[PDB]
Amino acid sequence: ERSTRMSNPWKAFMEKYDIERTHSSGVRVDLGEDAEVENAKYRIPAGRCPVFGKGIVIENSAVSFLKPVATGDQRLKDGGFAFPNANDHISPMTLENLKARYKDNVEMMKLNDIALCRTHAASFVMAGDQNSNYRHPAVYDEKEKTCHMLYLSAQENMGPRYCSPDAVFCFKPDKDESFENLVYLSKNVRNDWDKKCPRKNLGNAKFGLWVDGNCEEIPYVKEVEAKDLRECNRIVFEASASDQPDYQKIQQGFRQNNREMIKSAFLPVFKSKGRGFNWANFDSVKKKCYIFNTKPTCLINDKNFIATTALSHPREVDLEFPCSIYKDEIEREIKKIVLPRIFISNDKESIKCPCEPEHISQSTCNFYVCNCVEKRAEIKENNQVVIKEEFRDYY
């Protein structure tokens, strides 16, 4: 008969979209770790996943934020956020030179390109902080195969009244089209981000909540117009988890090339820890972007939908829904007449409805769902999947 144990065949698959647990820091603004350097206090990015397509837009400036910081006799707006390019061994470095530099390190040579750039950037200690937690974030350019170290950690200065409606340094994180190939990397990004973190958007799929043997719609979502996946991915990046809290003195520090003043600029001396509107379902037909702040725990198979996260690439789409996930797991749980608590499959007979299974019209896998069964869990408010009262004590 039916198992009484609950089972989610999506648990492993869905781990990388649990941004609170896998990333654990701000997405739009990442300033989740504190660091002291020579008795000054800094905030620095700490998320463990990369952010594909993120850069810093400097308003009223055509200069790319990957240009080195502007010090000396130039204005702040003439430069960007990157390390001054004075030393070929520090920043920036091409993949080819990264590979040569660490050719004799076996572990380094096992890293993928992105993790190699992160490890190079994050491994640098400043000669005067050898005991400090401060390590610089990096931007890896996948098109140019180039690793840029960021000299300062600030990501947003849009607040001060001087940033409200031209000759002042105002900037914000964004997924500008110029940034499409860029990867934003804190010091903590996992070397196995490809297995553990979001990257590609999920085609023929929308995020759902697993409720006792079937993937269900997220009831509380916010609808936003979006012309395409890119716009939906940008919208949810603007709404995602954020850690964000005299200009003339700041400009004097840059002119004077003052390390403390530059690196602490635009940071006021809290932490999202990954919580926010991090996920979105994109209706490709109705041109709608449905963002939500609840961790998803499964995917619904829908040919009209693409599932995106704030961390995901702006446009890469993996189209192959895992159609065998239910059938494989039902066979896996049979090894434990004990039939698992899974009421969806592409094999009709593998479920054994007390009635006739219903085909999902937008299922590319031709999934059938058994809705004529006792359900032992439900969705409370704020998208909270809770065990029903009749079984709460029993579980």
Epitope: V37, E38, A40, F83, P84, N85, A86, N87, D88, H89, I90, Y102, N105, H120, S123, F124, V125, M126, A127, G128, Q130, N257, N258, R259, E260
Partner: antibody, heavy 131, light 110 residues
Framework: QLQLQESGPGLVKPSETLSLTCTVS??????????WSWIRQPPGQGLEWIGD???????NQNPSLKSRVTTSVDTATNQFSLRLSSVTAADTAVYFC???????????????????????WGQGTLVTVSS | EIVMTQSPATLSLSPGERATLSCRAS??????LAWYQQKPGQAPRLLIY???TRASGVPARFSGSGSGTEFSLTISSLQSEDFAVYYC???????????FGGGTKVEIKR
């Protein structure tokens, strides 16, 4: 208002120790990112860096003078000093004290310089080695 | 050590003319290079760091360029007050082991 002042010019006898002090005003020698160094210039000649001192207490020296060079810093009086022992006529020079914008980065057992330039100098003090 | 060689030894030009001063490294030093101007009886004054970053307060007619082993300082329009000895200085290794070039004397024709 940063200004550096070397101690006054004078004589040092051969084989004895040259002693100089630099007095920093309009700023603190306890300033991260900045080292305080000595650079010298024999008459009619070029520039030679001697060594520095950092406010935490560490010091780099020109490897060809290391055995004869001692620097020190007084965080209370905002001064730093130079001691060059066993001087010969080859040490007759104008001695500048200077603020050095310093920044190095180290990974995997090797350090690499980002900045080590001299943005503010004293006036120079002529030291003559003579009997 | 890394040796810095400056060329020419002396430069004689007229006000308003473009002066190009050369500094070569015995060994590749990326862009860890500074330029200084020393007037008679005065201490050197910082012009450029990172090979091309002009220091705060330096007139715009001074500029530097180059990488690796070849470097230049350019005075786009020589002024009569630009008479000085100009020095380059590398600082590539850490712990610092800086060295200077031998200097280029810029004299004004009249």
């Amino acid at each position: 208002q940063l200004q550096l002042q070397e101690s006054g010019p004078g004589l040092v006898k051969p084989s004895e120790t040259l002693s100089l002090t630099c007095t920093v005003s309009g700023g603190s020698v306890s300033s991260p990112g900045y080292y305080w160094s000595w650079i010298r210039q024999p008459p009619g000649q070029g520039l030679e860096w001697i060594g520095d001192i950092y406010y935490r207490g560490s010091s780099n020296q020109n490897p060809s003078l290391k055995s004869r060079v001692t620097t020190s810093v007084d965080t209370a009086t905002n001064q730093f000093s130079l001691r060059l022992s066993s001087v010969t006529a080859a040490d007759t020079a104008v001695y500048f004290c200077a603020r050095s914008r310093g920044e190095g980065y180290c990974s995997f057992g090797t350090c690499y310089t980002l900045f080590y330039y001299f943005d503010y100098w004293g006036q120079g003090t002529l030291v003559t080695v003579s009997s | 050590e890394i040796v810095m060689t400056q060329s020419p030894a002396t430069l004689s030009l007229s006000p308003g003319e473009r002066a190009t001063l050369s500094c070569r490294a015995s060994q590749s030093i990326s862009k860890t290079l500074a330029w200084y101007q020393q007037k008679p009886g005065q201490a050197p004054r910082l012009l450029i760091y990172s090979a091309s970053t002009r220091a705060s307060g330096v007139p715009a007619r001074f500029s530097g360029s180059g990488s690796g082993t070849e470097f230049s300082l350019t005075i786009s329009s020589l002024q009569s007050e630009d008479f000085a000895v100009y020095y380059c200085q590398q600082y590539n290794e850490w712990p610092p082991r800086p060295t200077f070039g031998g200097g280029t004397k810029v004299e004004i024709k009249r």
